[PDB]
Structures are given as structure tokens and as C-alpha cells.
Amino acid sequence: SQQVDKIKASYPLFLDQDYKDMLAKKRDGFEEKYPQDKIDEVFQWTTTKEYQELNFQREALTVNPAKACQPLGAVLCALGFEKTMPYVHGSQGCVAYFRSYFNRHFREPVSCVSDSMTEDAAVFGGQQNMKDGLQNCKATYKPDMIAVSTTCMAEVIGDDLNAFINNSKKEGFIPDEFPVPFAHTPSFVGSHVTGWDNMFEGIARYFTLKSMDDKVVGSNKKINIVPGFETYLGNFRVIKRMLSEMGVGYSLLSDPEEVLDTPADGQFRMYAGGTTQEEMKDAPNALNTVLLQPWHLEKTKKFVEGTWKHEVPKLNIPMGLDWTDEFLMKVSEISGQPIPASLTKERGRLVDMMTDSHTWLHGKRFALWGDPDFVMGLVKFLLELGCEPVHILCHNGNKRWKKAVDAILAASPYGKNATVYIGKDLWHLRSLVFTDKPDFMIGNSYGKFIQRDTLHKGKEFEVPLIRIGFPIFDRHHLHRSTTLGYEGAMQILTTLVNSILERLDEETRGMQATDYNHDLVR
Amino acid sequence: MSREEVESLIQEVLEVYPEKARKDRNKHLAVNDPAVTQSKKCIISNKKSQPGLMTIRGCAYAGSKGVVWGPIKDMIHISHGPVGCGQYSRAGRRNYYIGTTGVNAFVTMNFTSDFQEKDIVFGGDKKLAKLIDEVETLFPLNKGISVQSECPIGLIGDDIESVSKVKGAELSKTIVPVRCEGFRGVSQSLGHHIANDAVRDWVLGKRDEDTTFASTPYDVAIIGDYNIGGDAWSSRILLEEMGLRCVAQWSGDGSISEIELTPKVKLNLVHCYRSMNYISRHMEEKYGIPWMEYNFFGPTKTIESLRAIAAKFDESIQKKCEEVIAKYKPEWEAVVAKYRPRLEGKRVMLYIGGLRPRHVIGAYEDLGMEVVGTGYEFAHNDDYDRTMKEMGDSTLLYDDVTGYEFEEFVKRIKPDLIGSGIKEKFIFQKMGIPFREMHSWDYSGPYHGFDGFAIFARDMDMTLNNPCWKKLQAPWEA
Amino acid sequence: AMRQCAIYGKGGIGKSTTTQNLVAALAEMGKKVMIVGCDPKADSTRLILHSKAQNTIMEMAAEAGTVEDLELEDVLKAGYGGVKCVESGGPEPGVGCAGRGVITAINFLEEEGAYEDDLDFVFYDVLGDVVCGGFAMPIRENKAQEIYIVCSGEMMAMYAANNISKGIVKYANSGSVRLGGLICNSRNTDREDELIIALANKLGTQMIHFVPRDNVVQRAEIRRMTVIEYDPKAKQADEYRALARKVVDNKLLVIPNPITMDELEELLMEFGIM
Amino acid sequence: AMRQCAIYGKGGIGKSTTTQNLVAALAEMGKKVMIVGCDPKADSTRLILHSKAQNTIMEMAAEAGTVEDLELEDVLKAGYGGVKCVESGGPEPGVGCAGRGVITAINFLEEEGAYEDDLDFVFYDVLGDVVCGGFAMPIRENKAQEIYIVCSGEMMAMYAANNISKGIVKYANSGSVRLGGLICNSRNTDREDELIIALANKLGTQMIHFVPRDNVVQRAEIRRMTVIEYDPKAKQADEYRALARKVVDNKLLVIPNPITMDELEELLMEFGIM
């Protein structure tokens, strides 16, 4: 039954007595489930240390991975170029999933096409698929460039992207001069960030490799900025703002912020902004190339050093105070412009916020996960705040990244209780936050389930989730936030300190029980 | 408006395609005319998608793991292959369930083999066996394991059936190998078929030689209801309120026990014909269980279906159905009297997967709303045959519509409301047209039954009449 | 009834020719045989059909949409001796995935009931380089129960046969398929009989027959015919008849025990000089 | 310098043996060569290393994590006469996907700089059954420039060579890879040389040094070496020297015009009778 005045959605419709009776009767009569005591015993066992040992002995099973596959990152990289259609050679279900993923994260349209390789295309190869798909996509959506990635099926059967695109050009399906950069993006290698790196390297070598003769380093007096896999629009915006405030000429390659933040004014814009082809052509003329997230831009680093002859600086991700300082000083030493007073004042305001909030931040223990560069920057910033990043997990991290983060932790007294895990999924982290409980956990939306699990062990064991990373599905407009630069550090600090304060307010809200500490002034 | 103009619109839209693509897509667009007896002459469907045209369709893995197998609560479903598919499909579909996640229920969990390059080159059968052992060690309360194949598994010829047999014998567990590699078929429809065949071959016959279940004459099983937003629950409470015993639910809030007990029931109420008609026919021709299509979208369809189902039982069931109808009459009447004036005369265009493009038309018409355009991602000829009796005269019908086609159709037709998936929502929201997600119910629901109808009307009015749609144009522009 | 056998061996060792001549001799003995060619080249049924197979499962599936819109009579054809012949298609070399083509063809044949007849023998002629699971599809469960490997006295073919034995072991343990024996197609190097019987003994199997190398086979295949149909009075025709009879009455069925590379080279140095 | 050749042909026709003997002949002339085996059977470098190459790129990569952790010195090893030898790994027969392994191994060789200077020849010995795009990895753009197809007078061998040419056509049009010529391995067939020459003319190419069938090759290869190491003064050693010389001085690089099945049958009737 429903009251037309107050209509209940599923919650709390299914808390009504008739629905509860129906669910209980269905369970009793036909589900044949384990006794509630057995379920409680098994849950309590899953929260134990022995279960964590069994969990960390896993070799074949992955449970709740904190990573995605390469073509997702390839599509994100391709989206950052002007009037560019992402085109995934292979099966269409992959494209549907990539589009749905990015739609849910950004709450924006995400344009991507597939050549719809079926069983016959798997057996015979997708060369006809490539020809017809390139022609159809160009005729239908009129992109100025089609950026080609692959699904796993096309990589397994060895679909030669270069040969297929070249044959499509010679047979008149697409114009010979129409830019079709390509990259092999096998989903069974690396992760989505690897796909971003592969796609960017393919796009770079498409526009630069064969025309290096008339290129001289520094002739445009600009700085190349490679953002890598980035899903925070504010990060693109902050990098642009900090470089333009500095008076530094810059070229941000793969700029997707416009196409993922189009206005609602009665018009749908499939393309908006993005790195122009002329920017990529002129990129070898830059003074240098700075990689924002170097730990998943290794192939790009090799190509830029070996082909453009740019001495790519050894810069960490510009996250937190020290690394934003290092990024700004490196940009200064490259472009020759000084760091302006506005940036110095912004840094000082960050320091003021740090001093204002250090008492609440100091000593707080954290479990965090995400991509390697973001995770490392978060670890560094947490150390700067006096926090303890006890559980640092990176599913797509490697041994060298783990060693670098271990060296970062060793340099600070707040990294003593910290452990770095690579190749571990979120089930490992659920065990970790059960057995060595942190105060909070920082990560994407999947961590919410871990929070749920902790709340089942009790309110005192609940580990609240702070939503920073990708993807964030259960909150709106968090993709507009910033994590890089002083502004990103300020936003992260505000989020952390206010999460702590809201948690403390909740834990002291019980009148006559804990409200003696329900302070108005914190 | 007018059969001629919409045909002209179809031709103008098709004008931009290359000749091959235009020739193909012309057969997938039509103008409804109830003077047509067979949809084969009208519109053809269930064919290959044209490459590079930005189709909405999924894959066979989406139709098997994401649609049929995934909702089963107590079974652990392993996305066999690389990491992408399971990660993107993890909890994207709101097939609601009751259980303790990670202990005895696993629906929103993502189990995967996370294939690396060496797993492709040297095979993953040994890794699959080790994964099954680890699943047993860490999830001992699971009541079944299904192995959903992704594309590489189908490509490299991994013998997942042998692994399933050996490990199931060794552990006394039901391990169901599903050859749902994404490149099979053309859409999720073949995923439905493969998942149904896997259920038939590995699950449905486990209790064939078992008579320890007490069977009452009023035993019905809900088939093809995936409990989106609690839909199945909102449906179930109606059936059991008219005396029926709902032994099984397929597969939203579904348990493997219910699927095993399905052959013991006396009637099979199929909601989604497209996804589960295969198993309905199999059970009809093996166990002799009749199956009937019903519809719980809107008061008219709900009452009609309840009376149709009651007519298949005793007089007591019919009296209980009549008393249910009389009891729920004031509530849906109040919903109509509140929301129909706000929605009367509003035009709706739909594009959903394979059942809802025609099933929800009655619910919209219960609020005075006319469906002027509809279409399917992956429906078959019989689905469009059923669609003709429900769509109005000279209404647009589309199959596997492209983004360009659907955008142009919306621009010309200019409907008041669009019902489609997440990949169209923000496109049409930016054009200033109210959009309702007709897959996930826009994270609302249920929409089935009378309570579902109240929620559906509230959502339709909330989105259609939201003030935001009057603010798209800046006041300093003409 | 209805024995199912799979013909494996080194590339170009004569699996197609030997199996086609064997099937011709079997049909001569009144046996209803079926040939499934699991090779992207549709060359496993040129002699029996007297022409290149122009209707393969993959070709007809691609020409009619998907494999689920195909029928048996479109791909299954009969040739000499009434032998029903169907060919798994596949890509031209260097593209696509022939393993998936074989997988799809075998799955189609199983689902359509391509075998439910008065069949006495079903032979899967596989290619030489079994490089993926798809080409081991004929020896899965409820598939070919016997395997015959065709070999010769040059040590590369011997190492190949050992490698196919290594690959066969996993399906032999996982299922019920067994190595019936070794067919020796002659190359006449130094000592073929001794080398091949020694390898078979090391693997735990027999040498079911020795087939000599004579040019009547090539002359018959130029005319697109088996030796049995071309020259029934030829010595090679009687050799193929003897091989057929030895196949019918064969009872040895052993899980192979492949030898290491060192043991194989020791066998060659011991039985492969003068 | 830096000539990149891909050795293809019908299965078991003698691609690995002829390639190793030709490489030995080229290395005795002071030419620096490197052999890449693109067969999951790592048997294309045995007669050069005098042992089975136990370490392969795929096996080393699987053991040592991924392929990035590997080093060239662990897979690239010298042999007789300064011949660098590497082998793409692979699964045992009937499992996994060897074409993907070949793709990954060749990508690893490219990324690690195995194609350094002072290397006159790089020979990709590929398996006979090119079932997927992966085994066409050697003839991808900027990878191999010349294609040598080993054939013989058998109908199956010529059909396989023509099918391989059909597969080559797409890469030849896509890139700069061409068909250098048809190396002939004698199988002692009626009008073998005539058949090979006619087929080469129909394809638009030549037959490069019809190689006689001799058991000195079998002996040398059973003693774990090429003929050059075994009997330098033997007739077949001089034949391999002549083959190397004819390979060095070759300029006929064409896109093959493969002939249909009907034209193949006409060729067989015209030159395969008497």
C-alpha cells in the first residue's frame, strides 16, 4: 500500500510489515539459506587475522579489484583531443561498458564507437570491421580525428591495427590524410593507466615521429604538460591556472575538461575543446616535457626522451606542499619565469590551513588506494599533515613504485607504521582495515562496501570512507574537485579535517551519554 | 506527426550514412501501422550492429553475467578473463536482494580471474582451478559457482567445462560454465540464451529425482523479473495476496534453491519474455508446466494480468484476486487523480533493451501520456509483433538505434519526455528534454504493481515538470 | 558404436592424405565414415569430395550472419563411398583466429546433431601446429576417443610427436581420450621402422602400421582422388586397406608418457645411425 | 646491411632446417646473423646452439614476472660462428594461445633493442600453419622486408604456399614487405622443379635454388649441428653455400598475385603429370 501524500521508494517501502512478512516467508519457504547464527559466525571469521592470512595467500582469485582495463584509459586519453572520436577495435560490449563507466562518474555524455567485431570477425579478423567502422564513424559523427584502441579479443588474435588502417586508407574508405592514430591496448596487460599511456604514445608518434627533421627544442618557448589518466576536471584547471599565473607558455596535451563539462543550454556538443592537432605537431619544439603522473607514463617518457630529445624532469605528481613546490620550481627553472606573488600567497594560505587544522589531523591513521601517482601524492601529503597512511594499497602498482613509496615513508617519522601493498585488491584491504583498523579510509566509491562491512562488526569498528579517487558513483559533482597544486591540497585538507570533525560530532551526539564533548567550537 | 512526415524524417536521417549502412539501417526503422500482421515485412531485428555507428548494445557477457546469472544471491559469479568486464559490470544493475554480502550473498561483489598476458599465452585452466579452491577457502557459505567467460576465454579455447566438472565433483558444488564470451551474438540477447541454456544444463535438473517438496495447486514461479529497485518484490506481494505461492523468482532476489524448485511449480508467470522464454519453453515441454506472459506496469496492466492469472486457478484464487483489486483500487485511483492532470497529453519516446519499450506503454497511458516513439536494443521479431498491438498509429519504431539516429529523431519529434539508458541521459538532458532512466529507474522504484505505479507517476511528474527545464536558455539570449 | 578418432602429427607429415585414403578404404569395407577437417585450410576433403570444399562452416556462418542461423545440409556433403564430409573453415594465413573457427565449427556440429546417424567412424583431421586450445577441441570430453599420430623417421617429426603427446596428456587425464597408436608415413631416411617403434615403445604405444612413400599417392591427388579410388590394384591401395583393417580391430589405448629432450636425443643417437 | 627475412612455407617442409643451414652458410662468410624462432616449438635454433634452447622469451617472462623484467642476455645467446639465437616461447600443444606469445616476444625484442647495428641478417623462422595474426607478426610493418616461402612439388605444399601468399597480400599492400622468392626443398616428385618454377611464375616470383633431398642433412641434424659444422666439403654443404649466395644477391621483391583453386588445378595437370 502507498499513501499518495507520502510515496515511499524502495527504501523505506520494503521496511513495511507486509513486505517484511513476505521476505521472511520467502526466505523460510524457498531460499534454504544458512542459519543467522552461522552467517554471523562466518562474518566474524572473515573479520579475523587468520582469514586475512588466507586472503593474502590468494594467487589466482581477485575480489573487488581496484583497477580497470587498458582501453578505458585509452578512451579517456583520446577524449582529450579536439573533435576526436574514440574508436575501439573489437567487441561492442567493451565500448558500452566504458561509456557507462565514464557516464556514471562524470554525469556527462561520453562519445565512443566500436567496430562491433562478432564471432565471424574474431575468426576472420576485423579488417572489414575496421574499414566499415572508420568510414561509418567519419561519415556519421564527422570527427577531425579517430583515435583507435583495442579490446582484448583484437589483441589476442593479433589484429594488426596499422595494416588495417592503412588498407582502409588505400581502398578509399577514409581519406588518406585523415588522422587515425592507433595504439594496441591489451586489457590483460597493466591497467587503464597503461591504456592511457599507450594511447598517448600512439597519438604522439602519429603526429611527430615522421616529421622530426624540422624540429628544434625550445623554439616555441612552451612547456609540454602530460596529465596522464585524470578524472578530476579541477586538476586540469589548476594546472592551467598555475602555469598561466606564472606567465609560462604551456601546451597541455590531452585536455578533456571541456568535453566532460559542457553546459546545458539546449544544445548537445559531442566535441568541445581538447588538444589541437597543431599542438601535437608543434610539441617537439617545446623547451621540455613535464609528466604530471610519471609512474604510468613510462612509454611516453621513453618516446619523448628518445624522439623529441626532451630532458624530461624527475618530478613527482604536483600533489601536496613539497611536490607542488618542486613542480613550480622546476617549471621556473625551465621556462625562466619566476614564481609570482599570487602563488606564494596561495602556498602561504595552504600552510595557514595546515597550522589551523594540525591538532585534528595529527596522528590520524588512514587506508588509501587508487592509481600509483595519485596514491603516492596522497601518501606524501598525509605525511606533510602529520597523518599516518598505515594501509597504502595500489592494485596496478609495481615493485619500483613500491620502493619509491617505501623510501618516501622512511623519510618521515609518520611513515613508520605504513605498509605498501601492490597487486592487492579491495578484499585484501577489507581484511586490513578489520585487523589493523585505521580511523578513515580514502578511496573511490567501492570502498563504501568496506565501510558497510565494518559497520556490521559494530559502530566502534566502522571505518568511514572519504571519497577521493576514481570512480565516484554515489556522490554528485565530486569530479569537479581538485587534488593537484596548493588548491587541491587545500580541498583535500578541508575534506579530511571536516570528515574527522563530522565523525567526532556523530560520536558525541548522544545526549547525556557522550554529548559532554559535543563542542560548538572545534 | 502523420505517417508521411515520419517516413520523410527517417529518410532524411538515413541520408548521412554510407550506402551499405543506410541500406542496413533503413530496415531497422519503421512507422507503426496495426494493419500489419507479421513484423517481418514491417521491421527486422536481431542483426549485426553496423560498425562505428555508436550502438547502445552490450555483449553476451552483459546478457549472461550482468542480467541472468548475476542477480542470483547465493552463487558466486566469476568473470573469467581480464579485469575490465567484471569491474564495469560490478553493481551497475540494481537487481535487489536480501542477504549478508561477502558471507552468504555476493551479488555486488566482483569475482574475477584477472587474466594477465601469461594466462592468455599458456591458458587459464589451472588458474581457474586454483581460483575455485580459493573461492571455497574464503567463501565457504556460497551455494554455487558460475564461471562467466569473457572474450579471451572463448578465443583461446580454455576448457572451462572440464574444470567445472572436475572441481564440482571434488567439492560437491554446482559449478556452471557459461560460454558467454562477449563477441558471440550481436547483443545481450545471445547472452540471455546462453545463460538460460547453462541454467537448464547445470541447475534446473538437480532435483529431478526428488519428491520431498510439498506442492500445493497454487504454486507459481515468477520468471524474467530481476528485482530492479525491488520490482519483483512489489510484484510478488500482489500474487501472494491473491493466494498464490511464489516458489521461485527468476532471478532478482533469486536463490539457486528457487531455481531448483521451479520444476515443482504449477504455473510459470513470465514477465520478460525476451530474456527467459527459452527456459519457459523448456519447462513447458519437459515438465508440462504452462507459462503465461503477464505485465505489472501500471494499474490497467496489473489488474488485467492479475485477472488473467486468477482465471488459471480455482474460484478461491479468483475471489482473492478480486478482493486484491478492490483493496488497491483507491490507492492507484488517488495516484491518477493527483498526477494525471500534471501529465495528460505529454508525449514520450522510449528506447530500452528488449521488454520494457512495449511493456510500460500501458503505465504511461494510465497517466494520459502518449508514447510516440519506441525501440529496442536487442529485441527479436516476436517482440516487435507484440509491440504493434501496443503502439499507437503512425508511431516511430526503431531497432538498435544509433546515437545519431536517436538524436535526430528526438530533435524532429520533440517529445516531452525520453526514457532510455545512462548513455543517452545526459545527451538529452543537455538538449533540454526531461529524461528518465528506464533501466535503473533512475535509482528509484520499484515501478511494478500499484506501489510501483505510485513511484512511477511521482518520478514522471518530478522530472517532466521540474523547473530546471525552463532555465536552459540564458535570459540575455533570444 | 561409432568410434571417434582424431588425426594429429607433424605439419606436412601426411595427416590429410593418410586419413582420406584410410576413410576411402573404410568405406570400401562398408563402413559409414565422416570426416571433419579442423584446419583453416579446407584441404582435408579434397580427395573424397573430388574438389576443394566450397562450403565450410565458418564461410556459411559469415555469409548468413551468425553461426546460429546455419543448417547442417548447407555444410555437410557426401563424397566417395558415401562418406559425409564437413570442413571447418577459417581465415587466410596471418589473420583472424583459426582456433576459434575450429571451436565454432565443432560446437555447431555438436549442437546440430551432425553425428546422430548410422556412423561407424568420425575422423577429425587436425593441423600440425596445435598452438591453442581450439585445435585440441576434437579431443575434449564426448569427442574423439582415440588419437592417431602420424610420424616419420626424421627427428623433427619425432620431436613433434613427443610434443603432441605432451599436449595430449592433459586431455587424456581430464577426459577419456586415449592414444590408439602411431601411423608411420615413410620418408626413408636411415632406419624408420626401428626409430618409430622405439619412440612408440618409449611413449607406451604401438606402431599400428607403416605406410611406404610412393608417387602413386601424388599422382592420385593430382586427379583429386584417393589411391583406393584411383588405382585399386596398386600396392599403396592395399597398404591403406591393411591400415584400415588394423584401425578397425585396434584395441590398444594408452595415456602417452612423453620423454624429455635428452632422452629423445639419446634415442636418436642410439637408433639413428647406419 | 640489416636484411630482415621471414621464412614461411608448408608445415614440415623444412623451414627450420633450411633456415639454419642457410644461416650457417651466411655466417661462414663473415655475415652477422640472428635467428628468431616464432614457433612455440623452440626447435629453430637447435642445430646452431647444438642443444635445445631451454630459455625462451615466453617461459622466462612467465617465470620472471612479466616480459619487462627480462633482459636480452638471458634469451639472446650466441652459437656456432657468432650466430645470435633467440626463441619465442609458447605453451605445450593444445593449450593457451601461442600467437599472442609470438606477438609479445617480438615486441620485447623490438623494445629491448635486439635489432642493433653490425647485424647483417635477421631470420624469422615461422611455423607452417599461420593460424592467426600473431604468427604474421614477423611480416608486420618495419619488421621483416623479405619473405621466403619454402615449397615442394607436392600438391599440398604448393597449395600451402599459395594460401600463404594470399595471406601475405594484405601485409604487402599495407607495408613494404615483399616476396623474395620460393626456396624449393626436394621431395622427389615427378617434375618437381617444373612445378615450382611454374607456380613461381604464376605468383609473379622466382624459384631460388631448388635444394636436393639428401640424408647428409638428416645425419648432421641428428648430431645436433648444421651440415656446415658436420661435413663442410659435402655436396649439400656446397648447395647451402649456393643458396646463401643466391639469397644475398636477390632483387625480385614482389607482391604475390595468388592463383585460384582452378588455376592451381590447371597447373597441376600441366606440370604434375608424367
Ligand SMILES: Nc1ncnc2c1ncn2[C@@H]1O[C@H](COP(=O)(O)OP(=O)(O)O)[C@@H](O)[C@H]1O
Ligand atoms: N605415403 C605418402 N606417399 C607419398 N606422398 C605422400 C604420402 N603421404 C602424404 N604424401 C604427400 O605429402 C604431402 C603431405 O601433405 P598433407 O597430407 O596435407 O599433410 P598434413 O595434412 O599433415 O599437413 C601430400 O601432398 C602428399 O602428396
Ligand SMILES: Nc1ncnc2c1ncn2[C@@H]1O[C@H](COP(=O)(O)OP(=O)(O)O)[C@@H](O)[C@H]1O
Ligand atoms: N634438404 C633436406 N634434406 C634432408 N632432410 C631435410 C631437408 N630439409 C629438411 N629436412 C628434414 O625434414 C624434416 C622437417 O623438419 P623441419 O625442418 O623442422 O620443418 P619445418 O620448420 O617447416 O616445420 C626435418 O627433420 C629435416 O631433417
Ligand code: ICS
Ligand atoms: S532482462 Fe533485459 S536492457 Fe528483460 S537485458 Fe536489460 S532488467 Fe532492459 S528492457 Mo537494462 S530485456 Fe531486463 C532488461 Fe529488459 S538490463 Fe534490464 S533494463 S526486462
Ligand code: CLF
Ligand atoms: S565484449 Fe563483453 S565486456 Fe567486452 S571484453 Fe568481451 S566479454 Fe568483456 Fe572486458 S577486459 Fe576490457 S572490458 Fe573488454 S577490453 Fe576485454
Ligand code: SF4
Ligand atoms: S594461437 Fe590459436 S587462439 Fe591464439 S590467436 Fe592464434 S588461432 Fe587464435
Ligand code: ALF
Ligand atoms: F597442411 Al598440414 F599439417 F601441414 F595439414
Ligand code: ALF
Ligand atoms: F613443423 Al614446423 F616449422 F616445426 F612446420
Ligand SMILES: [Fe+3]
Ligand atoms: Fe550533467
Ligand SMILES: [Mg+2]
Ligand atoms: Mg590435414
Ligand SMILES: [Mg+2]
Ligand atoms: Mg620452423
